[PDB]
Design a binder for this molecule. Structure first.
Ligand code: ZN
Ligand code: ZN
Ligand code: ZN
Ligand code: ZN
Lengths: 63, 64
């Protein structure tokens, strides 16, 4: 059920898909586009959800 | 502005759980299987069923 959140636009820019996975260890939060997630990591921001160090930003494609 | 309708479909492998097992290769990820099923694909040393590139890691993904 989470799951329908992925049909919403990016929570930041509100005009791109949620295709930017924010990875920290073996978990990830997918609530932003790739663009916005990249910007957050560049800014040294932590994950907007769990406040963990962003180790990696991945562009996600659904299949 | 939005992901495909596929996103709300369950794991293609087991059809019983959400697509929360992200398959990581480089700076991209394919999201099509649950965590449990995606872990089996990596264990069995199988490539990504979508792009056939090697599976670097599986990330349990939340959407929040
Ligand atoms: Zn965005
Ligand atoms: Zn997080
Ligand atoms: Zn599954
Ligand atoms: Zn792939």
């Amino acid at each position: 059920e989470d799951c329908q959140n992925l049909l919403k636009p990016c929570s930041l820019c509100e005009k791109r898909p949620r295709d930017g996975n924010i990875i920290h260890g073996r978990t990830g939060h997918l609530v932003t586009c790739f663009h916005c997630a990249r910007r957050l990591k560049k800014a040294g921001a932590s994950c907007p959800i769990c406040k963990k160090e962003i180790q990696l930003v991945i562009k996600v494609f659904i299949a | 502005s939005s992901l495909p309708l596929n996103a709300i479909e369950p794991c293609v492998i087991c059809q019983g759980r959400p697509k929360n097992g992200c398959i990581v290769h480089g700076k991209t990820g394919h999201l099509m299987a649950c965590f449990t099923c995606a872990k089996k694909l990596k264990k069995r040393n199988k490539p990504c069923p979508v792009c056939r590139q090697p599976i670097q890691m599986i990330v349990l993904t939340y959407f929040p």
